[PDB]
From a paper:
Vertebrates possess a second DCTD-like protein, [name] (NYD-SP15). Unlike DCTD, [name] contains two CMP/dCMP-like deaminase domains (IPR002125), connected by a long (>100 residues) linker within a single polypeptide chain, resulting in [name] being approximately triple the length of DCTD (e.g. 514 residues in human [name] versus 178 in human DCTD). The C-terminal deaminase domain (CTD) of [name] contains a potentially active HAE motif, but its N-terminal domain (NTD) appears to be naturally inactivated due to the mutation of the proton shuttle glutamate (the HAG motif instead of HAE), suggesting noncatalytic function. In this work, we provide biochemical and structural evidence that human [name] deaminates dCTP and [name].
Numbering used by the authors:
A (entry chain B), B (entry chain A), C (entry chain C), D (entry chain F), E (entry chain D): 30 to 51, 84 to 162, 167 to 219, 226 to 302, 310 to 375, 391 to 476
Write the structure that this text describes.
């Protein structure tokens, strides 16, 4: 099966983080340390994505790969290169200081280039072309996901997917070819301004947005479907729950071991005010189905599930007093439910498609009779 | 004087952690990083020792030596090797999935062997033969310990020692040679099934259990003896206090310099629910008398006391809101009492034998007149 | 412009930490890791500076540069070298155990020498001579600082300067050459007892005390001037606020190339008891105006402000429930105010000379319109 | 079987290197890098052992453990601590500048002590007590060695051992307790001047000399026995061949889990002048019959032979123009002969006791018809 | 005493290497690894300095600081950064492709700037201002050097110094204000084109050429003075001997703390053809008087002499077949002569001013009767 690239996932997550529900445009950000995500940020109405990462992490940004969805401003670049970041990737579309307006915006882009030159920071573009079968694979698996299939049991997917394609291309892409060349010249990408490198970057940029609109439509806003109980115990806002579930869906395409991909993400809600664009919520960990590191490949009994990787490679600890949520694309197995409950995760969001089913090596019986953790599943509103 | 080996102490502590007061058998665990204990776990009624370590530590298990008291199951082994552990030692007896019953257990043991070979971490047995004088030295010092000597002032020790020997032999040892050979064949120790490598392992396994029963009897349940106030402020359960004190007694035999060994262990009680087999309690730090690292050797003004090493080489911080207590085998000196009080440790458990004594380079006067820290000492129940 | 030496600042801060408001004398301490300050400690009436560092840091003292204001005692030296400190600088004045009295004091100093020889850590003296222009540069800038200039708007600075010169000479210096030679022979600096290496050390010691009394007088006690609100929300004690502001003033002289030096320090106040000599307050971070690490380069557009450096290279995290204070020598700019507010810093202490100004590349308009953060500025008491 | 310690072997080899045939006494030296010998030196009539190592290695002494047979003088110590050596072990009998005479010698020892104090090099004594069965094991295995058995088939061994004991103890040991007491006071070993540490060190020193005289006598100068060919190509001098064979015989006691021990050493003869005390010859590599660096568990099929270890962990390369010879205690097997011939080793010195024998997992048939390499075997002089 | 800076000495040596006797201009180069010189190169008539370093070192240029005397061309820069060099310092007077002529030269400079921008290696200028007493100190000591004093005992020094000042400033400096201003604009040094940074760089550049002309005149071509034998034996060409002696004379000012600074350099002559600008002659090692590294500090007894540092920190080995010679400013002591003779150095060049003298802790008696090593001393031609 096709496997999503690491730099393509961190780029896709950065674009998705820009769409977190809430002259200078919004910017998402992914902070990656040792090829593991250690933070997902968004630009609040007060601060920037590159400045929130400095507040949240500080000197811990040393030797970190930062993936912005817009080129960071001069103020936001000097602070992160001083922190110690070694790689700053960005989406080659309109930067943070909107060039589609100004003298200040155009002059600021020049300052970034001078700052990029005399500094050792690898401010570059890590965007990569996808595999030919990747876009077909994502569309095929999205229609079979636990969320589209749940609605089917109640044509709509393609209709909703087209709207996301329109919405995510007037936001993450410069439709005009002449406008994009101006931006690429202004942000120090002259070698990418000439064909076929201009068309290669543009095609791949459109290629990744199609994948994002395909994944984002797999957890759709449609006919009042959301995450609700089957009976803290309070549900998240539906916009946040769907956004965090798409993050798990994106991680599900990093799966390497099984033909069916599972991805999980852990989010916790602070009890105090926060400077991030996500609000009180912050990112705890993420993971996907994979073999143990080192190629440790009965074939399913040597895999680390999505929930287990999230609890293993987590940056922030689970605060007992806080409300911490986990978003698993599928029903947690009998192996992961004790770990999720044991780790102190208060709420579980998943798709109750495999619930109650016993297989040869995996079982989904503990999820249904789980006590102590609130389980929200994709379904119609009981009210 | 004989000095306990590092791998022998981590093996003994793992066996002792299995006896923490509270198909698949209980397992103790010692997580060691940079030759320093950074966690003492036990198998809860819900989770496993290997899975609890993943929850408590996560990715911090990287480059860690884990000492189980039973061979971890395939589920627990795949997670810890994924986290990045370095050396998975285990007690070469009945594994976690009990072989003394089943087809599922035998298949699971095979699954570990395939995972052991595919993976990189060294799943080995670090059990070592004891020094010839070690067992005699341990018995000699245990009769002169601050707890047995306190009892005599108010023949019994050997009577209690024999009972522990019987109890710990039917638990940590396979008495039947036929049964043990089946286990060693099943758990991949084929080259330890033939003599003299079969009697060597069996003798050493029995040799360490004799040492454990000797140390465990030095803090005995006898004539309603426990840790009570000499007159939070609430005492720990007597089973927990004695268990944590034997941990300090085990560390006291790593004392390299001074003729009398003192060991200390710090435990803290969380205010929330926990997934560990020890309950709300968790391990903060441990230490013993030793010269400053790097062989920095009066001969007593260059020694780092047991309390000071525990405060120095501690994994978890002392939470001011939590109830944290320290178990020191001997009365804390006038040098360690301010450090224990200053660090925020709420309770002190020790043997008030040296209390009030004024030696040349060491004094025990500040312990008696200590304000702000609850002091529990080995004595009769006042009520 | 003159730039303060890295080891001269850590030496000056250690002397200043000894003056934190509250047989054995007080001792200040600076813990430096990777050339960044990770702790500022004083000596409480119960504990020592070298023992408080062990409590606050523990094993985190590994590979740390410790700058004491007095030579640590044998008890304090053995604990820090056990932790893993590599370099222990000290002020070559009277040590912690006062030699200006005793047989116990003189024997303890000899014990340190054996410990210093036996151990590996570099117990040395890093005091360095100042630049010729440095001493009058500090005096010139101090008279033009935001605090002396504020008073003049309401011939006095030199009277304060002389008083602190007298106060800091009878405290940090041994005026008698006979007494100092005895101390230097006792504390193992026998090669510094002979000229010209005896007058060189004494001259350097006098130059730093002259510089310290110059900086300390820049935030004077003249009249009723203090840090009051420009109408938690409660002000710090005036002695603490002035002391913490002088720390920022000392950091302001590490400014890389900018003509005007700005320094910031962040302090937080815990709600529980503490063992430190500073009380409940602990040190969060420090910084100064400087270009991004790696010598990055309109010239002001590529500089990291004092507040931004403090937020980046901070050891402790900003606890939302605690009281956090930042002391910036100049008025925070429009770049730093969102970061200080975003980071959760509850109170701002700063000057108000530049408030309301609109320069070309910098503005000070958001400070006046700041909501949610208490602002304290150098002014007379409104009451 | 008793396995010789690393620091005991490097100490034993340093003593043996002092006996290389050729006010200030001759000194042997072993240079160890990554626990592998990278040089064997002796004090020439012109230079010192510590100065020859600097010439032969230079900056390569960085992070190396040097094992002298006498405490290096001030000139030798300052040059090797400059190079960057890690540990400088020595035999605590009599330093290079002999104290059994002078004011200059006594003054120099004090200079070494001051140089040790202010430097970070671990100038220590790594001498360790032997295992109880070690001395008996060496004695019994020496009568069954390939060289004593050869003479037997043509009571003498004990007679040769006794005279070696007299010679080696008179040279490597200070017989007078008072005289040795003075030396340990002079060379900064006061803590070893008090019983039982004075008797422990003295007993351990005699234990290693007894072992050395046992190993040295195993390749005895009895009658006209030596290493002769079986009718370059010229034989080494018999004193050199016997000395180098004992080196290969001392390595034989590092054997890992194999009842019969095999050790190898490779020496090459330079075509030009040399500053070493060994003459034109230099040390190429050493190795003992042992398992791979990890574990390899028919059990003989996974053990690395002595010749293979020497060719693997060799410091100097085999120059085709030079005359290089290898000394192996046992006859090279059919597996090692192609490697020795292939590596370019010109001459082989061995014991032809098990030559021509074909065992199950090992054969010795290729040695008899080895073409291109001159084979010298322990035998009586043909003429 | 003033001490020459590291980056300030490697700059001086690079300029001096340009003057090695033999459109595009000759360029000297210093390759520095771990703050130790590992190569001195000059631009041959067929190759460039940056290309000879690649041939001589290859991949060993990784993590090396290269100090060119002219900015390397685009061809030379791309290969050295491909090798993995760390810093490329240069003398900001005129690049390799001379700008004082062309369109090709001006275009080439732009290519270097683009190459430096998108690459990672620090192409910077490490030139530093001299200490105030430095220039006077060198002028005073040079008149008292072994070579000026030798001629004096046979006013001239100042006359030769002025000629070197006239020659070296015409070559290493751009006298015209406008021409140097244009070059700094062309080579991407616009930040140094504005006062006072234009006058600062020009003044410091003049200070070093004055320093170089002062040192280069300390070994003058006055009358028929040269290095001739006191009583291979063949001497070097007088131009080469004087040039190599000035290298030693330059390192004499790197001496840690001695009024009598001593510097040494070792050179060897290959028997075959070479691509370097120095011919078959290549650089072996260099050194100066200094205390042992590691804070080491009868003061002269703990000083590693210039010859000893040269042998310790040599890069190339002393090949017996080649002709290798050492240049020491002072007469080798009785301690360094055995090491120079032992290391295999064939010839010694020195100043026989203090030959035969016997001080307290140093003697110069062994140099007079040194057999086996050819000795050449500064004297009049015996013909
Ligand atoms: Zn921005
Ligand atoms: Zn699962
Ligand atoms: Zn388990
Ligand atoms: Zn104590
Ligand atoms: Zn102290
Ligand atoms: Zn600012
Ligand atoms: Zn010597
Ligand atoms: Zn063999
Ligand atoms: Zn070139
Ligand atoms: Zn010398």
């Amino acid at each position: 099966i096709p496997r999503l690239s690491k730099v393509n996932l961190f780029t896709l997550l950065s674009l998705w983080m820009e769409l977190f529900p809430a002259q200078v445009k919004r910017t998402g950000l992914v902070v990656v340390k040792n090829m593991k995500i250690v933070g997902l940020h968004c630009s609040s109405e007060d601060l920037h994505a590159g400045q929130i990462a400095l507040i949240k992490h500080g000197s811990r940004l040393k030797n970190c790969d930062l993936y912005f969805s817009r080129k960071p401003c001069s103020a936001c670049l000097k602070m992160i290169v001083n922190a110690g970041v070694n790689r700053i990737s960005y989406w080659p579309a309109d930067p943070e200081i909107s060039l589609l307006t100004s003298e200040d915006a155009k002059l600021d882009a020049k300052a970034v280039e001078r700052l990029k030159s005399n500094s050792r920071a690898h401010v570059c573009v890590l965007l990569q072309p996808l595999v030919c079968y990747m876009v077909q694979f994502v569309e095929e698996t999205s229609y079979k996901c636990d969320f589209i299939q749940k609605i089917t049991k109640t044509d709509f997917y393609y209709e909703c997917k087209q709207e996301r394609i329109k919405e995510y291309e007037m936001l993450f892409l410069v439709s005009n070819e002449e406008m994009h060349k101006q931006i690429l010249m202004t942000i120090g990408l002259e070698n990418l301004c000439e064909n076929p490198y201009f068309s290669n970057l543009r095609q791949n940029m459109k290629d990744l947005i199609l994948l994002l609109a395909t994944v984002a439509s797999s957890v759709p806003n449609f006919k009042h479907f959301g995450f609700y109980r089957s009976n803290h115990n309070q549900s998240l806002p539906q916009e946040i729950a769907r956004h965090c579930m798409v993050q798990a869906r994106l991680l599900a395409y990093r799966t390497e071991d099984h033909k069916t991909g599972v991805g999980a993400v852990i989010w916790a809600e602070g009890k105090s005010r926060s400077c991030d664009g996500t609000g009180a919520m912050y990112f705890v960990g993420c993971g996907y189905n994979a073999f143990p590191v080192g190629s440790e490949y009965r074939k399913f009994r040597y895999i680390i599930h999505a929930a287990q990787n999230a609890l293993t490679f987590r940056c922030q600890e689970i605060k007992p007093e806080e409300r911490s949520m986990i978003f698993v694309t599928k029903c947690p197995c009998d192996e992961c439910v004790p770990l999720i409950k044991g780790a102190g995760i208060k709420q579980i969001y998943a798709g109750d498609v495999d619930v109650g089913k016993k297989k040869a090596d995996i079982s989904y019986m503990r999820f249904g009779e789980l006590e102590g953790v609130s389980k929200f599943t994709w379904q119609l509103n009981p009210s």
